[PDB]
Every structure is written in structure tokens, then in C-alpha cells.
Symmetry: C3
Subunit: 195 residues, 3 copies
């Protein structure tokens, strides 16, 4: 088989935030049985977040954006994802000139560990019987790889509607950045796999 | 064998902070030879930390709590842990209707890498010859999965006295939370295994 | 083979920041195919950062330092690294009284994922076509394992000149520490491997 499903190395951009080939997403999933081991970088090369300036454009919509990975019931990427299908496959093996095939359910984030979330009660004083938060990793990345340029990053599992599985990346910051390209330090986490 | 030792999926709560079935701890250990790969979520469903309000209860004891995993010399959970033994076993395999057995030493945190810590010198100006900190991962979780609701989380290895190995989770915050359920984003780290 | 390449357990110090045996670096690499799984602790036992006091020594050079791992084209440590070669090998196996040998290319950080970085344009307004940040994990450690004692830590891949591969650890803080030994909580991340 192959145990690593990733963003094939091409010099080309492969991702759309607002416009086609906005961005070059690096994303690597390596399977350790029950946990998938994730690593991700993001470079946005044109559009609103290549060179950010919030002194100029300070409205909320210029300080957050989202990226969506959307899979079918067999773990194949759907057209409507942010990531272009052509740049997403397993690593080498008998998948070198076997080219873009799939099944990949063992790389999907468990619908048991990460279910469709319930509807939060009417009263927020009322405590939950089951978790709204448990499908989110909330961490940071650093633009330019500089400690001074944080971007709050929320990875969320199986919360999108297009699909059967989903990995969603929601970035957002408060710092009023002045001329700073969105070019991220990498983020590493792990998640519970389906089978 | 099985390589993943975890909190069996049950809708039921499985953990005690102050009272029996206070809390529903999700905790997954996946073994990659020398490193154990950990993932953890926490939902507290009744007690002091289901709905936190520190405008009402502002004393130090309402802004910190602890969870303890305690193992014997073979890597079996002891009764006195926060986590209920009945909800802790390997993942499926020949352990589906083989039910709660164990040995699990390869999932234990190394007593060589994480020893009983020495006694810190009389003078704190005096520098150490061996580490007090090296058995702690110190990170955060996010209540509601919201960047604005951090909780400082200190995972500590083999520091408890009941036992032969130990994984301890010490949560604590300064934010004066007003009506906020302790429902955590997940935390991922790795640790050095025994054998 | 062996899948874990690490800092052999010895009570002795094994690392040089400014002077020989300054420091006792714990560092463990465990290979999961395409990703290397890293874990690191640091104790500095003499020199400037055993007992830090920035009320006394407040200049920039007393609030940052660096550690370098430098490998040849086969993944062998070079003399000039911060880490002493004698304390760095695979874990047991047929490498117990086979002693210090190597090849270890599969533990090296990919020169495809982590290349020699390009030269940042003349104008910083000009947006990049390829990433300057993508070879850095930027995170923290906690001196004494205390949430109140952060140290910003930047792990950087293949940026040094002595060598063919490199893992570099750049620590730095703003807090004016008063009498606090540099004794770190551990840091865990993963990185993309070569082959």
C-alpha cells in the first residue's frame, strides 16, 4: 500500500482561497494505525493575503479566511475543496505512473471520534451532555516564521456539509499587519482515524 | 497485538474529578515504537466545571483541577485513577469479546526518560545537575474550541506516588470565566516509551 | 534496522552552547515512514544559562542562544554540531556493542520539503513565489515546566552552511528572568523525511 497521502511536490500553486491558484498549500498525512499524523504549511501568492496590509484594509473580512478539504465516503477529495484534486495523491510506490486513483478511508478523521456536532441548547447556562469542542485542534502559525506574527488557526473535523468527511482550516488574527505575506510556519497535530 | 490503547467509545461518562462520572475523558495512545503518540479531549458534564462561573466562585480552587492516570508495573490502570478502568482497553483485534485484560508496558512513559525527580537544592540560585522540568509537556486547550478560552494544561509523567507509572493532567486558568462549560479542544503530544 | 535515533541515555552532559559540556540535550527522532517524529528537552548546567539573571545581565546576547545539529550526505552528525557525536546513535538492536556507526538518511529532513531558501526580494512589498517560513516550526518551551516561564523556540530545517542536512534550535525570550535555570519542558513536532 502507501502510508503517506499528501500534496504532491510541484513548484505550482494548488489551492483557492478566493481565486484559482491563490495559494500553495503543503499538507502531509502519515498514518500510524489509529492516528493520522498531519503537517501543514501555507503560502498565498496572490489575492488578499499575499502581502497583508490591515492599515489599508482593516475590516473583519481582511483578517480571516478558510480552507476546506472535503472527502467522499471512500476518502476521495471532492472538486469543491480548496485544494486542487490534481495535486493530491499518495506518495510514490505503485502510484508513480499509476497516477491519481483512490480509496483512502484509513486517512479520514473518524466519524465516531468526530461526529456531526449536536445542536447547542437554547440556554448557554445549560451544560452539554456531549462535546461541541472535541473536533477542533486550536493552535497558531507564524507568518514569516516570526514569533511576532501569529495567526490563530482552528483545524476542525467533519463539520462541513458537502461531503462525508472534512478537514477544515480556519485562520484569523487581531494584529493589524502592515505589509506581511501570509507565509506560515508549519503546524503539526494528529487525529483519530476511521478504518 | 494491538498498537492503540484508548478510552473505549461509549456515550457514558468515564472520569472523576471530584464526584463519580463528573467527566467524559477522551484519551488515545498509539505506539510508534519508541514514542507513544497521545491525543486528548475533556468534557465535564456536572460538578464545578460543567458551566464555570468565576464571577460567582472566584477562589483558586475554582480555577484549577487535576486528572490522574495511574499504572502498575505491567501498565494496568489502578482503581484510584481519575479514569474508570471499565472504559480503558486496547482497540478491537482479539480484544473485542476478550474484554478487559492487560499487559501494556510499551505504552508506559519511560522511567529512564521520566524518572522520579530529584530533590531541588536548598538554594534556588544553585543550578541543577539533572532536570526538574523534563517530564512535563506544558501547552494549552481551548474551552468551546475558542481561541479566547485558553486553559493552561500541564501533562506530567511518573510524578504520582500510588503506582509504577503515571500520566497526570493539571489544568488551570487566570481568565475569570463567566458561564463557560469545560469542553476542551484536543491536545496532541508524544512521549518516550519504556519497553 | 532501528527506527529511533536519539541521544543515548548517559548521566553526562553532551552539548555545547558556548563551552564544552555546557548543556545536556535530550533529543529523540522516531521514524514513521514519511514523517520523523521529534521530542526534545534541554538542561544547561553551567555557562550563561544555568541560572539566568537578566536584571544583572540584560543585553540581547543574554536572552537568546542556539543549538545546531549538522549532518553529512549520509545523515551522520558532524563534529561542529552543538551535540557531541559520542552521545548520538540509534537505539539498542544490533547497535548495542556495534557502537557508533551510521547511515541515517531516512531521519533527515527532506531537502525537497525544506530546501535552501531563496533570496528574499529587494522590496518587501513584493510577494514571494516560494516560502521563506515553511522550514520552521515556531513554538515554546517552559523553563522549570512553569507556564509563566516561556521561551520562544524556533526549530529550523536545512538552513545552516556546514553540511548537507541541518536541524537548528533557536531559543529567545523577552521576560527579564531573575535567577531561573534553563531547564525546559519538552517540545514535540514532526517533520518530512527525505529517503
Amino acid at each position: 500500500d502507501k502510508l503517506t497521502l499528501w500534496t504532491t511536490p510541484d513548484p505550482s500553486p494548488n489551492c483557492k482561497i478566493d481565486q484559482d491558484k491563490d495559494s500553495k498549500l503543503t499538507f502531509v498525512l502519515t498514518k500510524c494505525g489509529s492516528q493520522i499524523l498531519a503537517n501543514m504549511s501555507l503560502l498565498v501568492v496572490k489575492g488578499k493575503f499575499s502581502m497583508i496590509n490591515n492599515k489599508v484594509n482593516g475590516t473583519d473580512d481582511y483578517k480571516k479566511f478558510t480552507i476546506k478539504l472535503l472527502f467522499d465516503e471512500k476518502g476521495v477529495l471532492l472538486k469543491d475543496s480548496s485544494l486542487d484534486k490534481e495535486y493530491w495523491n499518495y506518495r510514490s510506490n505503485n502510484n508513480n505512473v499509476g497516477s491519481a486513483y483512490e480509496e483512502a478511508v484509513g486517512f479520514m478523521p473518524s466519524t465516531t471520534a468526530y461526529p456531526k456536532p449536536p445542536t447547542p441548547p437554547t440556554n448557554p447556562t445549560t451544560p452539554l451532555e456531549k462535546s461541541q469542542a472535541k473536533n477542533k485542534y486550536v493552535s497558531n502559525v507564524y507568518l514569516g516564521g516570526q514569533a511576532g506574527n501569529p495567526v490563530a488557526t482552528t483545524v476542525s473535523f467533519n463539520k462541513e456539509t458537502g461531503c462525508t468527511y472534512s478537514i477544515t482550516f480556519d485562520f484569523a488574527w487581531n494584529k493589524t499587519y502592515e505589509n506581511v505575506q501570509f507565509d506560515s510556519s508549519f503546524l503539526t497535530f494528529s487525529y483519530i482515524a476511521q478504518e
